[PDB]
Every structure is written in structure tokens, then in C-alpha cells.
């Protein structure tokens, strides 16, 4: 049995192992620096530390059971999985993180949880869980902000622990900069110790600076270094949030850039204000209805097989419904589906006029066309989605009375979204299906002579 590293079980385990990694990264330093926190809840700390070590062991076992992909297949041989694990640097990191340093609790004493700092070497699982969540969630930016806030709170917490440890080393209350005397009823309280240390660290790492100024040299050095770290942290927060904001409205920026370029062209080329407003309305329609992306330039990112599967799933039924293509083989229908070109029209747009060159066949997807008269108001027929026209105009039919010309005025009652099959496209598709070509042309001949 092997875990697919792209499945849900692997992600759930990433969460499960991120829990003790976060617990260690937040609490080992907190118990190392705030001695009362370590010595007053030592029973809970023992339980939680050894549950975390058990979960680390289970993480190593899982990492022996996680199949990597070789020759496009998931490797599921225990020998190969264990070999790829042990050969990896992650195995060394996991072994180091699992090295029993709690045995120093007998020599050093119960006031040294620093020994469990090796548990921090499982950071890879936590970072991997975050990376996987970011590529998995429906809210990538909400999670991105949550992850940024988590990093910032952990850095501020670590810096608070460092401030309290520096105050302890210098001596609580020995000068006005360090944390005050812990023999005071108010500032000797563990909640106060941690919360004032966190307040100090937030003041310093967010470059507010409303803390008692340093007294001693080491304090000046540490406060300088910590102000610089805080400047870098603030710059990183701003950089991350600004990169996220850029990516959030990069689509709108690109769309508005296209709009502005076309406005510039139109105003420069003295396009009439009527057509200028028609173009502005068209782009408003595109943005409002989430059709700003070009179908061709969007499907180009897919592979040929997956793009063909998409095209089939979208077009094959309506293309079979066409009468000429009703009884042609499947490979030809796929070759034709791959050659449909989307043509979107506005309300009142004429798809065809009587006398236009008919070189293309149109299929209606999500639209309503009106066969109208020369006056352009009288609707003979209303062609809805799934319907089509011009299927004879794309056939080379020997002896055609009326050809190469549209005999109807096809108008868009609004936002028709047609899909077009040109004559050259049909010929290129038929170049490998000659019996299909002759059968199609004979069927069109039967249609005409009717």
C-alpha cells in the first residue's frame, strides 16, 4: 500500500504532521525562554512533546510509503521507496529531528527544553503543507495572507522569546531596557512576561519603537539588529501583499491595457463615435460576462490530447446533429471539432447578408439568430442554439445552381457565440478521409437537387 503524493490522503497527512511541526516551532523556544511556562505545565509539555515525536515517527514511515513517479507510473515497491527516502536529505533531517535529546533532561534538568530544538528540522513538512494548500484551495490569496500572518506571528513570538532571554541573561530589571523584575507581582506573572515580551517584539519588528531605549551596548546592538530585522520583515510583508495584489488584478490590468490600446487606436484613426461606443460596450460585455480570455490562446496551454478531449466534449454533439456530418466516421468528426472557430456577435450584428460570400458554416452555441428579410426587421425564422446554417456553402458540389453566396440575411438577436467551420478547414480535414469527402459531397448534391 502506497500513498499518492498528489491525493487527498497525502494532503491530510501533511496537515497532521504540520500540527506538531508548528507546535515545536512555536513552543520549544517559548518554554526555553520563559522558564515558568516550561516548569508550570511540564506534564502537558511531556504529553505534547511525545505525541509530536510519535507523529514524527509516523511521518518518517509515511515518507517510506510515499510513491514517487517513475516512467509516468507511481513507484510502489517498498525497496525503491525506502531507497529514495534514505538517499534523500529529508531522511537525514528527519533522523536528526528524531535524535533523542530528551535524554539530556536527566543531565541538564527539566528547565532545558532547548534540547528539543532539533524537532524544528521537520520544517519541510510544514512548508510542504503550505505549498500544497496554496495550490489546492479555492482561496489562494486568503490562505496566502493567513500564511504570511502565521509567519509574522511566529517571527514576532521568536523575537519576544529572544528579548526575554536577553533580559534574563542581563538580569531582569537591572536596567530600564530589559524586561523588569520578575519578583514584582505584576511583571512576575507568566501571562505578563509573555504578553509584554510579545508587545516589545511587535513594537520592534514593526518599526514602531515605543520601547524603553537601550541602556547597555549589547542592548544597543540587539535593538539595532532587531530594528533592521523588523524593517526587512515589514518590507517582506509589503512585498508579498503587493505581489498578491498585482496578481489579483493582473487580469483586469491586461484587459484594461487592451481596452486603452484600442481606445488609442480608435481616437487616433478617427473611428466614428458610434463604433467607438460599440467597441466600449463590447469590452464591457466581455468583462461583465467573464469572456475576456481568447478561446484559442487559452486552449493553446492544453496538450493536444486534452485540448481535443475538451473540444469533443464541447462540440461533438452539435457537430453530429448537422445533417451532412450525420453519418461520417468519428475520426473525421474529431478532426472537424478541432477546427471550429468561435465567432461571437453583438445584438443586431449580421452574420450573413444575401449576397455575401458563403465560405463558412456556422453552428449556434448559446445564441439566437434571426433569418430576416432585406428590410432587416421581418424575422422569417429564429435559429436557436444547436442549430446551424451554411453547411452546403462549405461543400464542393459539382453542378451547384446557387453557390458561393448567402441566400439569407442571418442576424444576431444578441450575443450569439457562433462556431464556424470554413470550407478550407473542411477540405484540410477531409484530405485524410477521401470516402468521407465523396460521401459528403454526394449528400450535399442530394440536398441541392431536392
Amino acid at each position: 500500500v502506497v500513498i499518492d503524493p498528489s491525493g487527498n490522503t497525502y494532503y491530510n497527512w501533511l496537515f497532521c504532521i504540520t500540527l506538531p511541526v508548528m507546535y515545536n516551532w512555536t513552543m520549544v523556544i517559548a518554554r526555553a525562554c520563559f522558564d515558568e511556562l516550561q516548569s508550570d505545565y511540564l506534564e502537558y509539555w511531556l504529553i505534547l512533546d511525545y505525541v509530536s515525536d510519535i507523529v514524527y515517527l509516523i511521518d518518517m514511515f509515511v515518507r517510506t510509503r510515499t510513491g514517487y513517479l517513475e516512467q509516468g507510473l507511481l513507484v510502489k515497491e517498498e525497496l525503491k521507496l525506502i531507497n529514495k527516502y534514505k538517499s534523500n536529505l529529508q531522511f537525514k533531517l528527519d533522523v536528526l529531528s528524531l535524535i533523542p535529546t530528551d535524554l539530556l533532561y536527566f543531565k541538564l534538568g527539566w528547565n532545558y527544553p532547548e534540547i528539543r530544538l532539533n524537532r524544528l528540522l521537520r520544517f519541510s513538512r510544514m512548508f510542504e503543507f503550505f505549498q500544497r494548500t496554496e495550490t489546492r484551495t479555492n482561496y489562494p490569496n486568503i490562505f496566502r495572507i493567513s500564511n504570511l500572518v502565521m509567519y509574522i506571528v511566529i517571527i514576532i513570538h521568536w523575537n519576544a522569546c529572544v528579548f526575554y532571554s536577553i533580559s534574563k541573561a542581563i538580569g531582569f530589571g537591572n536596567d530600564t531596557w530589559v524586561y523588569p523584575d520578575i519578583n514584582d507581582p505584576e511583571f512576575g506573572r507568566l501571562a505578563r512576561k509573555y504578553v509584554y515580551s510579545l508587545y516589545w517584539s511587535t513594537l520592534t519588528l514593526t518599526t514602531i519603537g515605543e520601547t524603553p531605549p537601550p541602556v547597555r551596548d549589547s542592548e544597543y546592538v540587539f535593538v539595532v539588529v532587531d530594528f533592521l530585522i523588523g524593517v526587512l520583515i515589514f518590507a517582506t510583508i509589503v512585498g508579498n501583499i503587493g505581489s498578491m495584489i498585482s496578481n489579483m488584478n493582473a487580469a483586469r490590468a491586461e484587459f484594461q491595457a487592451r481596452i486603452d490600446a484600442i481606445k488609442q487606436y480608435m481616437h487616433f484613426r478617427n473611428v466614428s463615435k458610434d463604433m467607438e461606443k460599440r467597441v466600449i460596450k463590447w469590452f464591457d460585455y466581455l468583462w461583465t460576462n467573464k469572456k475576456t480570455v481568447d478561446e484559442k490562446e487559452v486552449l493553446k496551454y492544453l496538450p493536444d490530447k486534452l485540448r481535443a478531449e475538451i473540444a469533443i466534449n464541447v462540440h461533438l454533439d452539435t457537430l453530429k446533429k448537422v445533417r451532412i456530418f450525420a453519418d461520417c466516421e468519428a475520426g473525421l468528426l474529431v478532426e472537424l471539432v478541432l477546427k471550429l472557430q468561435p465567432q461571437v456577435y453583438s445584438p443586431g450584428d449580421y452574420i450573413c447578408k444575401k449576397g455575401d460570400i458563403g465560405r463558412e458554416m456556422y453552428i449556434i452555441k448559446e445564441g439566437k439568430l434571426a433569418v430576416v428579410a432585406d428590410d432587416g426587421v421581418t424575422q422569417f425564422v429564429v435559429l436557436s442554439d444547436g442549430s446551424y446554417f451554411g453547411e452546403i456553402s462549405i461543400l464542393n458540389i459539382k453542378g451547384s445552381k446557387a453557390g458561393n453566396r448567402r441566400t439569407a440575411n442571418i442576424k444576431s438577436i444578441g450575443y450569439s457565440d457562433l462556431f464556424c467551420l470554413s470550407k478550407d478547414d473542411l477540405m484540410e480535414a477531409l484530405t485524410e478521409y477521401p470516402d468521407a469527402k465523396t460521401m459528403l459531397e454526394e449528400k450535399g448534391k442530394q440536398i441541392l437537387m431536392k
Copy 2:
């Protein structure tokens, strides 16, 4: 009767409903936290709250009357509109926002406007009005900054209300951090209460921090959380403004990148300093005159129908004015208009020399050409906009005495902006208009034999 959600009436209603949504989002919390604000203007608050509730009801009715687009047409059947509304989550939000919680004024008392916090669930209308304004205004960046400032002021106001409520819960003046005693003549005044709370909130959310430091633990916790919120707010302000600044000068950045790439090529390829200055002057002209965008790569964003309409509206009159195309059918003229290629020239640029291969026909749009002699200074004719030349050089005329060669020196008197119709383009256009082809070639023959 149905409202077009892309028209002016819908946008005006978005403003009308954004007014009470903003009123609620700003004033419900302010009256909940500053008790004197609620109890001293309770008559105005009742009037405004119930006008807001009436506008919320009208918003729900409007949302039953707002037509969505189906099959490219605006749905205007009351059954379908009401069904799409009630099925939407927005309907649930509107019902929750309209749930009468003012009835708690009888149980809780007049000092609990918190009950109207459900009115904040109409935020969707306000956000939609902002989104629509951004895509509608001539000043997207001015409105973007105004909207950012509005969000920031509302967040600072909410945080001021939270600070005052925390001071109230802890006790006004009980320590030096909370808002002072409200029994003081100066700090017991409602204007002072709100303005000092707003000052505190601005100091905290903008990471200035010149406030009295926390005394109690909860105050330390809240000040840490509020400093972190303020860091995130500042990072968001910077990210939004920097994204806006990037988008504002992204066109200039792209243009300067092209300029620098061409400068790099020229300096590397040892292009003569004369031509190097000619290229620099050309790009200065492009930028100064708002022609930096490539016409082809700009019109590629349009649909084929709208691009054809643009091309017609720009070129069809000058193309009809041509003598050979004077009496050819309209479909051919559109097919030709779609094949004109813009060619811009600099002052003194030769479009043609005597002996150059004449394979292209030129139409002058916004320019002045000079038919000059071999010396290149004597102007025979001055060809202005609308004029053309080379229309015979694009015809395959059987038995042509002088062909394939230009017989004139056509020079640009400056920034001519020609539109070119090549011979291959005319042939590809005529491939579907054979009688047009034979008539064009016979007309060119009559022109030559003249």
C-alpha cells in the same frame, strides 16, 4: 419592465443602495460603541435607519427586476428573474440583512443599535457599486485611490470604535491606556470621545504608536493584534498604490523596454549614429503622438465582426474613392479593407523610387506625399490624404508595357501614415470574386492603353 444590469439605471441604483450600506457600515458600530452618539441623536438615527431599511427593500425588489443574460438575450420573465434571485446566496444575505432586529429595541433598550449589524450583510451592493465605478469612470486610478482611502477610513473608524468599547469594558480612566474618564468636561464630550478614539486608531493602524502604552494584559494583547492589523493595512495600502503605479506606467515601461532593446541592437550592430538618431527620433514621435501601439496587434483583440466594422468605418470611403475599385461589389471592398496594412513614414522617407518593384498600392491617410524628380528636391505633385498611387501595379494586366516597376519617386513630406494593399493581398481577396477580378483587370487594361 426589467433593468439592464449593464445600463445607467442599474449603476444609479447601485449608488442609491450603496448610500445606506455605507451609512450602516459606518454608523451602526459608531452608535453601538459611542453611547452618547446613539442616545443623543436617536431621532435622526431612527429616521435614517428606517430610510435605509426601505432602500434595502427596494434593493431586493430591484434585484427581482434585474435581468440576467441567457442565450445572449436579457431574461425579462418575472418568474425566471425571481427564481434566479431566490436561488442565489444574495437573496439569503438580503433577507438576513432585513430581518427585523429593531424589535430588540423594546427588550434591550435604545442603547443597543448593535442589533442593526445585520444590515452590514448588504456589503455586496457597495462592493458591486465600487467594482462598476472602477470599470466605468474616466479616472480609474483617482477612484481607486478614493476607494482605498474610503476602506482605510472605515477600518480606522471601526478600530476607533473598538478601542472605545474596550476602554468602556475595562473602565474609562481605570488605567492610563484606556480612554480617560468620561466624567471629565473635556474627555466626556462626544466630539472628543470620537476624535481621540479616531486619533488612537490612526496612530495604531498606521504603526506610528504614539499612544499611552498598555497597562493590562488584554491591553497588551489588543495592542499587539492592532499593530499587526495596522502593519497588514499599511502593506495593503502600499501594495494597492504600487500595483496602481505599475499599471499606470506599464505602457511607458514596455515602450522604453522596446526602445532600450533597439538601442542595444543598434549599438551592438554598430548602426551608424545617423540612423541611430533617426530611430530615437522615430520613437520619440511615436510616444509624443500616442501611436506606440501596433495597429495589427491592437485590432487582434477585437472580434472578427467588430474588427471588420472598425476597418470599414476607417478605410471604406478612401478605398471606394480609388478608380479601379469604384464600381466593385461591397463584399470585395470589405475583404480588401480588411487587408490594408498601415505603413508610417518619416519626413523625407521615400515610399517609392523610380525603378523600385511596384507590388503594392498605397492610400494616403493623414499625410502628404510629394512626387519628386531624380534629384529629389523638385516636387511635381503633392499627394494629400485620401489620395493614392500604385493601383495599376497590383493588377495582373495582360500585355502591360511598363509594369512591376515604379515610374515615380514618391517621398514623404512628413509622417505620412500610408495604408498599403499588396498584389498578393488583392489576389487572395479576388479568389472568391472572379467577375470582380476580370472587371478589375479589364479596367486596368483600359487605364494602361489610354
Copy 3:
């Protein structure tokens, strides 16, 4: 006589008129707010104000003499220039800025230079000078930073003047927030007044906040508004500098993105480490020698005429030096120059091997090729820049003994930078020059039969 708005005279005048616009924008408010500054140097202020008004008059005259571009030519008819000026909004702004408000000095007194605030309506000239400098200087980013600093200093100066005016209106020293008593020997000094106001404004607009806190309500309101303005100013500074930094290393970012994509391909496709290092060295060479931009994709931004002029100026001499093209007409040589394809090679790269298909002709630009033996170390000939080979392999010569195959091993002694003329390119170029084709092929025949 008419000024070219793209020439040096117009830019020099932009500087000349920006001087009084900057003087007004900085000094009118300073004299309005700091009364001793206005009343102690009133003689210098009169001289400077009226020199500024004279320069504003000369600016209006210049703007009547500035030719706009119509039909690609510079309009230089005084009637048309004056009409385009007076019809413009800039003319209204200039008239308003020149409205004599100094006449109020008789009614209001010498302590009211606020009357000259209309002179600030010439801001367009200053902004235009900055916009022109940015597109003109060799140091766009240095000037960009200087312009940002100028804007920031002017905003801080204006805010300092506003702080001093608010202190004056409330009363100097009436509370601890306003500017102190100006009857003090130290704080009553004009240098102190301005420099402390500027210090206050810098503390507030840069969100440092180390100022005496507000006492009164209006002071709280103003300090809140000024902190928010300062947050927006800081965000704008960061946005501008970050946009500038992005544009500064966008070329390196794009290049490194290409490098990383190719590294990803190579590592994935298991490209041998030898070729992997060859590719890395090639990209290091490209970046180190400023050849990262693709010649084709760089020249595509030029117009056809200017791209042809570049190609001629780069290639025409070496292409004439070729023996087959020695006596062919100029249009054909230009058509061929436009078809040379750059081919860059690395040291030791073989351009041709004995037996390779010879379909292309090579011209050496900035390189050294070695005709070597089959062993590949013995150099028969060393082909330098300007030299060429393969000119027969691109000719269709009837009855060729040895054709379609390279008879030499051409090796690159390092970074050869060849330009290639394929056979298909020569045929496409000759399709319009048939006598050139027959003469070229007969010349190649004479070469072969020799």
C-alpha cells in the same frame, strides 16, 4: 517662426517656465503662512513675482508659437496656432494664472500673498517639463528619483506651511500642540519657524509621529488627516520606487526566467551535463555581452521602412562584397539584406561539415571561422569578418557537379555571429527580379565551370 515641440528649444523653454512655476508653488504658500517671510523680503518677493509673471506672459506667447502636427507636418500658421491655443483649456488656465490679483495688495495689504495662488495654475508647464525630461535624459531613473524627492519635499513644505497656519489660527503657544509662542527669542525667529514647521511636517507625513500630541479637537482631526495623507505619501513613494526597481531589473528577470525554463527543460529531459554547461555558458555570454535580445523580435518593433534602413546600414556593404551579388541591382540587394538571418556560434561550433546539406549562404560579421580538415584541428583558411562562404550552394545552377553538400568543415574559432541567406530566401527575393535570377545563375555556372 514656430517652435518644434519636440526640439531642444521647446525643452529649454519648458525648463525656463518651470522655474517660476516651481517658485510660485513653493514660495506663495510659504509667504502666505510665514508672515515674516513675506514682510521681511518683500522687495525680493516683488522682483521675483513680477519676473515670474513676465515669464508666464512669455509662456503664453510661446504657446501661441508652438506648432502642432497636422497631416504629419508642423502647423506654422499664426491663425491656426492661436486658434488651437485659445480653444484649449490650457489657455483658460494661463489666463486665470495671469489674472492680476496683486491689485488686492492695495486692499488686503502686503501680508496677503495668497492672492498669487492663481499662479499655481501653470502647473501644466512644470509637469510637462518633467514628463519631457523623463523621456529625454540618459538617466531616467535618477531623474525619476529626483522628481519624486521634489514632489515629496514640496508636499512636506506645503504641510509645514499648513501646520504653521493652523498654529497661527489657533494661537501660537495656546496649547502644547501648536507651534510655540513666536514672542520667544528662539521660536520667534523665522528660520526656526520654518525649520520646526518642516520638521513637524516631516515627522507627520513620514508617519514617525514624534510630535507633541493634539490638545484640541481640530488638532486631533488635522493630525488624523495628516497621518493618513502621510501614509498615502509613503505608500506612493514605495510604489514609485518599487515600480522603478521592477522596470530596472525586468530585463534581467525575463532573461533569468528564460534561463530557468531552459534549465528546467534540460534537467527534466536529462540533457547531458556537458551540454547543460554549454547552455549555461552561452547564456552567461549573452548577458555579459548585452546580446540577450533577439534581433528579429527587436526589429519587429521598427516600421518596415526604418527596419529596412537599419538592415541596409548594417548589411548592404558586406552583401555587395559577395561576388555573385557584385553587379545586381539595388532593389534586389535590399530585398536580400532584409532576409539575412543572424546565426551566432560558440567557440568550436561547426557551422558546416563536409557532407552537410548546403542550402544556406553565410556572411561573417564580427567573427573568425576556420576552414578545417576532417580531423578538425588543422586550419586551412581563417575566414574573418566580411568574408563569406556557401554562395554557390544557394544557386540553382543547371548541371552542377558537386551540389547540395558542403565540401569544407567550417568551424567557429569563437563567437562568430554569422548572417545567413538561405536558398528559399534567395528564391523568394528573386521572384520579382527574373533577369537578376538568370544573371546570378549564369554567374554561378561560370564560377563552377572554372
Copy 4:
């Protein structure tokens, strides 16, 4: 002997010369401003200054020995190298930086190391070492952050030195703003002097501002200027880090933009949820396995020679293994290798079905294909990497019984990564190898008639 300016020796020397440049840039100002630092370690300062001057001399000699690239070859003539050095501005800068100003130690005294400020003119070597490291290291962003921190620490150090010099000029302790009296036991200590000056400079340049406010005017001016410098420094830090963060996740941003565009297309085109999940899984696979970049659009950045070398090194062995191409000449095999098109498939994807048009030949690279029956579960053969099929379907073999159709159902057992050689590609490749074409077709005939 000449140093390659792109080799390891040149980079090592860049480090060696950056050491004394950094030493000068950090210590000359520190000794100039902190007089006890200069006068208490004067022996170490003499040793280090003259070691730095020796290294500057060696840098000038190295710069005479650094070969530039001319005609693609490394210039290694001492005359030309020395000429290009002395003609350069860098030679003038090096001479100025080496001008003996230590001779002023006899006139000015040992308390004036300012004389060595000319040594700062070697900044070019330091900046060049940084630029070279950035384009050389495996950790460009880590080094980028380190270099930013180095610049910031040097600016803060310089500003600390400036603050101490201003305090000295005004007088230590003369007011509450300057550095206090240096006759105090605590603040007269050199460690305290420097560390408090550095603390002051960090407070000021990071816009924290928790320093004693200015007393005198010059102090107000300097503090304003230094706050503005610090605002610019913070904006530059944020801009650099945000540009780095943008470039770090620009690949993920582009990939997610493609994903979102395809999601938009699919949801709009009503693609079935099955295929929608198939596309999402495909993109997850692409990102997880570092194959997000399109092979064609990635290799387009390479030159033709290097792209051909890559293609050969990747494909030539498997292409030779093909039976029809087993004994064809090498130029044809390279022409064919350059025409392989990557086709990646998903588990269960059918590469071919019985009856599909066989126009393409497939080679398996990193995959496993299964020849299956019409039911699609029974595997006849399992085709692994290196294997191929369809090599007859790409040959025009006179008199072929079964052609143009696939006779097998080829299925992907998962992530097959095939490389395709179409029939048109083979024909275009054979157009220059006619004997290869006839031999290939006769070999295919022998295969068929077998």
C-alpha cells in the same frame, strides 16, 4: 597570460579586490568621524590601509591583464589590453583612488584618515563582484537579500558617522540632541560612541524616530533630511524585496493565470465536470513535476546550433534505434530530431485507436504504453521508453495493403511523454535527402511485404 573575465579566476579576484573596497567604504569614514577609533588602533589601520593599497595596485595590474572579447575571440595582446584599460574611465578612477593622500598624514596629522576617501573610488570592483555573484550563485535571492542588507548597514553606518561628526562639530553634550559629553565614563567609551551613533542612525533611517528631538536649526534641517533619506531607503528596501518576491513567484503567477483562464473557458463552455477535473489534475501534475514550461517555447530562446545540439543529445539515440532510420545518414537524422514534437499523455489516454488515421510516428520517452484490445483492458504488449510505433504509417510506400489507419489500440499506462514524427515532417526533412527517401520507402516496402 590573460584572465578570462568570465572565468573563475576573475571572479575570485573580484572577491579579493572587493575586500579592501568594502574595508575602505566602511572604515575610512568610521575612523574619520570616531577619532578614538582612528588613534587607538592606528597600527592596525596602517597595516590594513597599505594592504588595501597593495591590493588596489594588483587590481590595476589585473585590469591590464583582463582580456576583452574582440571578433568573438579573447584579446590577449598586452598593448591592446593596456590601451583599452588606460582609455577607460575606470583607469582614471583607479589612479585617483591610488593617489597618495597618506602624505597629508605628515601635514594634517594622524587624526585625518579622510585623506583616504579617494580609495572609495574603487567602488566599481565591489559593484562588479556583486553583479557577478548575482548571475553566478545558486541562490540569487538569498544573495540579493544579503547584498541589500549590506548596502543598508553601510548606509546606516555612514549616517551614524555623520551624526557623530555633526555632534562633534556642534559640541558633545552642548544640547540634548547631539551625542552626549564624551568626557562621561559611559558615553566617552568608543564602543558606546559607535553603538549609540549606529542606534541613532537606525532609528532615523528606518523612520522609527525615538531619538531626542533637535534643538538647533541645523539639527532640525539635518533630521528632516535624514528622515527623508530614511524614507527613501525604506522605500528602496521594500521595492527591492517586492521586486524579488514578484520574480520569485512570477512563474507560479503565470501558471495560475493559465489555469484560471482555462477554468473560465471550461465553466463558460460548460465543459463536463469530469473533463474539468481531468484538466485540473493535468495542471496539478504539470506543476508538481516541474513541466509547466512548453518545450517548444523554451527551446526557442536557444540559438539554432545550440537547440540542435540539445535536440541531438536528447533524441538522436532513440531515433537511431528505429529500424527504418537505422542506416540513414547523420544529417537526415539531425533534421528529423529537430522535428520531433513532444506529446504528453495522461494515464488511460489513448494515443491511437484501431481505425484512427495513422499520419504520425511515436517514440516513447519516459513512459509506458499498452497495446490493448478493443475492450481496452487486455494488454497485448507493454511498450516502454525507447520503444516506438507507427514508423510505417509515415512512409509513402507504393502498394500498401493496410495504410493510413492504426491497427492497434495504444493506451497510456500513465504520463507517457511521447515524441512524435509526423508524415509531413518526414517529407519536409527528406526533401533534401532523395536517396534517403527512396531507401526509407524501399525498407518500408520490405517491412510490409514481410
